[PDB]
Structure 1
Amino acid sequence: MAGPEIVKLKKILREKAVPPGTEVPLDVMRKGMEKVAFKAADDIQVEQVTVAGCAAEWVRAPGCQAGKAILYLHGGGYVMGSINTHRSMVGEISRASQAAALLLDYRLAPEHPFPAAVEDGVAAYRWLLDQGFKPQHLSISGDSAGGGLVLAVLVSARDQGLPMPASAIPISPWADMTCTNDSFKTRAEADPMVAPGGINKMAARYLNGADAKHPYASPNFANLKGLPPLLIHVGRDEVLLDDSIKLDAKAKADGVKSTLEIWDDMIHVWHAFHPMLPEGKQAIVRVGEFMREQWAA
């Protein structure tokens, strides 16, 4: 039985979102998301770098432990989103985890379709390793499309004989490009956050004709064996619930140490609304603890 903050939030999201079924230009969507992006806390500091040909920032909250890093892979359907749209939540994750985060501006579709984002994520993880960061001091985290891409980067890295990080935290991941999961209807009406055709257009654009079941496009179909300990966050009120429930079971089957938390009443990447959502704040804290626990073990 729900908190007033998530209830005032859902209404605002319903009010401010584009009516269903309506088809918005890509560059309007890109600009929309840029332009309402939260501003990072004033005590977050940032450093521009280029990694594997991409723009990135090191995002450093206070408390950052020397020698630790998180590779962060932002959300946005694989077609939008940027360093700017995610700096605020990654800042808070850096805060809870006491580790600096590398926030990658990875290649976006449709200008760069799949596997470009995966090539970039793996190339960044490699670069982290060429910098000196030890695998046991690493973590990878990502929301939505960034959440799938986390798993995809691991399968791919692993497949290329790269050593796995200490932990991985997909947040509301999209790990099944087919979008055929039951929670797409059972959960439709409770979710203010995601429409498709909306989400289907994104997959169409990312894939550009490629197998929707490719392990690296959709890791719910991947051989997950060897992957590091996982924590998967998802909200009960998202159409993408089933992605996480199935990812979790996939990881379990494949011998992976996985932990699924389904947050009651929560929406898609409710972490991003931390400035006014007690639950956003709490779940980020939790992402932190998990990282440090696995860096503890």
Structure 2
Amino acid sequence: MPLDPRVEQFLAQMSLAEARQQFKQGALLLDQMVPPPPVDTEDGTVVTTHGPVRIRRYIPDRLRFSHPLVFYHGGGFVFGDIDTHHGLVARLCQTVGATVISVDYSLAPEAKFPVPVAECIDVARWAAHEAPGWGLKPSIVVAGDSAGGNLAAVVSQRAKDESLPIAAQLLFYPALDMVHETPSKRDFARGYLLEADAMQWFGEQYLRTPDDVSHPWASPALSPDLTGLPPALVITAEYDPLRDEGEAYAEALRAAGVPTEQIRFDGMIHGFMTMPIFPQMEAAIEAVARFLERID
């Protein structure tokens, strides 16, 4: 099932602080290539158990969905911010007609595992508490892309113990298994934007020691019991190392009686939902909207 022609062409044609700017610079380029919709935003800070975490609450023109979204951005645990993922959250907000809190969680290696996992829970728990004050259901919807998809997944699995109501989880090409090699991983290890060397490195920045790989707050795919987790939208790209662990984990949720929609965007690569030059980005944001209609 061959590459999308638009993605094909993108691939064809190409210090910590330095690489971060570079990645910020790459994002904002795209945001000028394809302007985001305007949206009302508030800046703010949540008092978490690991310090203050900056957040941005998005507010849609029409409010249609009954629960807040909590978005954890990607970037491999080392890159990204609220501004990097403005393009996606903006659209999620307006297309879905929901309130989104984009979380500025602490980055690695200056914060190590499992600090951001903690932050993300505290913020979710904060949003649950705030939700009635906005005229919404206390339940929330966690969402993320890649590393952020990982957090979403982990927050969901801790949700019951942490007494945090979650009505759904949205996983955009997440990382779920740092222990197992998989056909897609292996097969798409170099040349499809997300590479294996990058992934080894990210895991050195993020983890304390190499044994953290088999920890379920790092590898949520390894948790043997998935019964009664929140409904899941699991979106994967075809030519992506993380594709296979994403799809297996979705099959597993489904076998554990968790309402699951899994969707592969054929011909696409990892990161495509923060890459608005592709039509498939907004096609997936449409999938998020449709899925979330079914949650009530």
TM-score w.r.t. structure 1 length? 0.87
Q: Deviations over 1:46-98 (max 9, x none)?
A: 21011232001012343333753100000011112100101111111112211
**What secondary structure does 1:10 align onto?**
helix
The residue type paired with residue 46 of structure 1 is T
CA shift at 1:137, angstroms?
5.0
* Structure 1 equivalent of residue 20 of structure 2: 30
State whether residues 150 and 168 of structure 1, in contact with CA within 8 Å, keep that contact through their aligned partners in structure 2: yes
The residue type paired with residue 150 of structure 1 is A
The residue type paired with residue 290 of structure 1 is F
State whether residues 238 and 264 of structure 2, in contact with CA within 8 Å, keep that contact through their aligned partners in structure 1: yes
What percentage of aligned pairs have identical amino acids? 27
In 1: Cα distance, 2:96 partner to 2:37 partner: 18
Matches within 5 A, 1:192-271: 192-209=192-209, 210-222=211-223, 223-271=225-273
Matches within 5 A, 1:270-285: 270-274=272-276, 276-285=277-286
In 2: Cα distance, 1:77 partner to 1:242 partner: 18
* Structure 1 equivalent of residue 179 of structure 2: 178
**What secondary structure does 2:106 align onto?**
coil
In 2: Cα distance, 1:258 partner to 1:66 partner: 19
CA shift at 1:2, angstroms?
5.1
1:8 corresponds to 2:33: no
Aligned residues: 281
In 2: Cα distance, 1:95 partner to 1:179 partner: 38
CA shift at 1:10, angstroms?
2.9
- The structure 1 segments of at least 4 consecutive aligned residues displaced by more than 6 Å after TM superposition are none
1:49 corresponds to 2:44: yes
* Structure 1 equivalent of residue 57 of structure 2: 58
**What secondary structure does 1:64 align onto?**
coil
In 2: Cα distance, 1:64 partner to 1:10 partner: 38
**What secondary structure does 1:193 align onto?**
coil
Matches within 5 A, 1:48-197: 48-52=43-47, 53-65=52-64, 68-133=67-132, 138-163=140-165, 165-178=166-179, 180-188=181-189, 192-197=192-197
**What secondary structure does 1:266 align onto?**
strand
In 2: Cα distance, 1:203 partner to 1:92 partner: 30
Unaligned stretches of 5+ residues in structure 1: 16-24
**What secondary structure does 1:28 align onto?**
helix
The residue type paired with residue 286 of structure 1 is A
CA shift at 1:157, angstroms?
2.1
CA shift at 1:260, angstroms?
1.1
In 2: Cα distance, 1:57 partner to 1:226 partner: 30
* Structure 2 equivalent of residue 19 of structure 1: none
**What secondary structure does 2:214 align onto?**
coil
The residue type paired with residue 102 of structure 1 is I
Q: Deviations over 1:160-206 (max 9, x none)?
A: 2322x2211100001112362221222335x5211122111111221
In 1: Cα distance, 2:36 partner to 2:197 partner: 35
Q: Indicate the larger mover: 213-222 or 25-34.
A: 25-34
State whether residues 176 and 220 of structure 1, in contact with CA within 8 Å, keep that contact through their aligned partners in structure 2: yes
RMSD between aligned residues: 2.0
Unaligned stretches of 5+ residues in structure 2: none
In 2: Cα distance, 1:238 partner to 1:230 partner: 20
The residue type paired with residue 222 of structure 2 is F
In 1: Cα distance, 2:95 partner to 2:109 partner: 34
TM-score w.r.t. structure 2 length? 0.88
Q: Deviations over 1:259-278 (max 9, x none)?
A: 2111110111311122x211
State whether residues 136 and 166 of structure 1, in contact with CA within 8 Å, keep that contact through their aligned partners in structure 2: no
In 2: Cα distance, 1:249 partner to 1:170 partner: 13
